Subunit: 167 residues, 6 copies
Amino acid sequence: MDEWRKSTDEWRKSTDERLENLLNIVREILDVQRDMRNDLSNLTRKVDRMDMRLSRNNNMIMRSFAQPITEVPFFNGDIPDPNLPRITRIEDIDSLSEENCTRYLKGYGVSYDENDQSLWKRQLAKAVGLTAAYDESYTFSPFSRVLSETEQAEKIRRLQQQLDRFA
Amino acid sequence: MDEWRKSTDEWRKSTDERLENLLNIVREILDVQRDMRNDLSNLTRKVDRMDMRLSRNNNMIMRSFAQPITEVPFFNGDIPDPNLPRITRIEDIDSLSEENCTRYLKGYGVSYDENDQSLWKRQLAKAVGLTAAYDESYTFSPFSRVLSETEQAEKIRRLQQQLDRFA
Amino acid sequence: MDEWRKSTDEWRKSTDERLENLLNIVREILDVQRDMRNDLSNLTRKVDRMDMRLSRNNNMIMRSFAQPITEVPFFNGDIPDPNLPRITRIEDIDSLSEENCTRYLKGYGVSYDENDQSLWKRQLAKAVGLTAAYDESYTFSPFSRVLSETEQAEKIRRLQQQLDRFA
Amino acid sequence: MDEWRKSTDEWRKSTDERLENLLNIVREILDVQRDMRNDLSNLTRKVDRMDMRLSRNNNMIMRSFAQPITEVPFFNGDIPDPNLPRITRIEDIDSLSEENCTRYLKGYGVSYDENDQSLWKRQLAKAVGLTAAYDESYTFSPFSRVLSETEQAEKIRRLQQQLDRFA
Amino acid sequence: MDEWRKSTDEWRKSTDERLENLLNIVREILDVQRDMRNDLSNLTRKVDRMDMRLSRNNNMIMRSFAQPITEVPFFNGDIPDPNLPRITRIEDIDSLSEENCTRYLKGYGVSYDENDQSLWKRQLAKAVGLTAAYDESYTFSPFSRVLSETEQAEKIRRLQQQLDRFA
Amino acid sequence: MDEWRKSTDEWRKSTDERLENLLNIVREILDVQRDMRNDLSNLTRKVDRMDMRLSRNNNMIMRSFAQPITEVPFFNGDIPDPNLPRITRIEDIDSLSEENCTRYLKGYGVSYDENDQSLWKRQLAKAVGLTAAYDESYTFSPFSRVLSETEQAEKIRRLQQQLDRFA
């Protein structure tokens, strides 16, 4: 019917506009997601590095009071491997297997020399926080349902493409 | 009209597909929200605990230089209660009402003994950062429009169910 | 056709409800975005302030062991200006141009006196972490595709209004 | 002969006076000896006590730098008995035979309690110079031709009497 | 009788020589006395000054461990006057009567300014051993049968003259 | 005359005994002198060595507070030679002419190696009192009317022999 006709025609003009609005809104919602995910995945890294430095500070103070020290976590906030011998004294750094020195030196951020293993012990003693007058005078002997981060970042990437290709 | 008929029929085949695409997109947008909310509500807790440890470190250094100390916040980043007497010396921990010791010991993270109140003073003196040679030799006398976090986490939960039930 | 008629009429009653559901869902998705953005932009500020305090703690310990000190970042986690002379000793604070003192004092959080420039050097020496027995006895001479934070916060604001005005 | 007579008579009057002068001189020489001997035998005691305090000071500084300590002599400048176990750590004071504690406590000057052996370990740890933050927090477990000085002082005494009795 | 005569004459030649020998011996005995008395009365002064410096060292170490200090004797090994208020803190030096500052400053060896009483408090705080980081930052408010030594030294002097005049 | 005769004979028996008494007294006076001179010339040496150790203690404390150091006298209480460059820092020990190192090492008591000059700098840095955490980590580059004591001791020796030979 003719008025019925034109009812549907105006209803065209409504609905198509409406769906265009929702497509626009969803595009910009997805952009804000992808940006917020990066800005949060940068704090997690900065906070983990601050945590390693905080534990090292505590060790330095304890050595000033002549007390033993405790454990220090790696870059990325994971406990040192349970295979590795603990470290509470210079004398513990002294007897390390030359292959458990590299795991520690890579764990913390230090940048060492791959061919000149003269001073690796002292690198590690400074990284752990063993700087006191008795420790600087020691004389090391030579070597004998849940998702994860990148998951949902990738999820957003494919979701954006999936929505784009159908427009 | 017959071509008019088939115009509408193809328009079926378009629009229903379109609405299915938007339902798919909104489901996965909501999942990324729920996961990002947890990953951020875990940093807030980790950062608050780091803040308590940072203030305690500052107190330890100040005691090494023989100066008075300052305030230390609880687990969850809230100032100690304003009713509680301040703490700047061992002699302030010494005269605590035995019921203002438990609020402090619960505030910080320490795990004490509920029946053996012999050493609660020393627990608290270590938690606040009162470790110096003069403080370890002290000899304590015996007791005589905005939303919040869980709000919008719950909001996401009900929103997900609300959308699911209508599909 | 009459059954064809009523098919379309029931199809009214379906589709309009469906679009109302998606408008509701998108409103509350946008609210959760705007709240999460603020709760994350508050951690970034708190973490930056904690970072300045952490570097200052490291300097204090180094002075306890009689060693030189290093650089300390501002409130908001940006390296001091490259024009400014570095600071590693009291004697470096002593010879500062009276106009490079205000940049440092504003950089760190200290609140100074604008007319009584007697003690600005000591303010800065405490802000950087130069508190040791030799430094407290020094006797300063007188003066002779990526988006950013607020971008996408504003984006959310306009996006919310844009969606509201079309409902 | 008469002039010969009077020559001898005047020679009386000379010689007897002369011997009286030498007796007077020797009396006061002997008094100055007896007084100088005491004034020197008081410095030897004061210097020996200062030596014990000087070694104790050296130990305190070494503990401030977190290093081991050395030996401390008794009141009267004699090395501790060679039977006694050495002392370089708190853990060495901890395992002492309860009868090698009294020799040390008598050696140094400390005045202890003969019946209340609760705190003898801490007395000794302070006497040797073991005061550092780690040592004040330790928690000791309970017990399971030449002459000499007085020679020649006595010599002077008898010499004075010997000369007096013959006048 | 003639042989009797010559017996006495040879006895002359003996006895006079003998008395000359004893006079010579007593002269040089008295010289050695006068020299030994000075060489001993110089150690007593040197040892007394060393004792003041030793007590001051002990106070400095105690302040490094953040403990209170004790008494320090004057140049010449006499306890500070019993009228004078004791000194165990900076806050005790702060409230001194401006006339009990001069007795202390004269007691110890310091050389002050008689007209410029600006810095007398700090002179005294260094003389007593109050150098720690908290004490260097304090901000003092402005002022509102026995003989003795010389006895027997004089005795030797008169004794030497007494013997000389009779030869 | 006969009674005159016997008067002189009894006067024999008196005077000869008297002179024998004075010879006995002077012998034992001289022995006490020779023994007291040694017992005093041993304190002077012990006190001089204590003085070197006392100045070294003062330097160690000053380094704990991060301050510069002062001069230290030799074994025998004489100021270091005025030709020698002063020492107030590690960097002053570093640039020493290799021939001003031996004068210092002989001055203080240290016993070095005459052919292995590797570690002479560190010997001297410990002898002067330069032990702090910054100084143990430094990395030295390689070398490019009055009498005196023995006078009057000898005087007593010859005096004793002189008196003996005439008896």
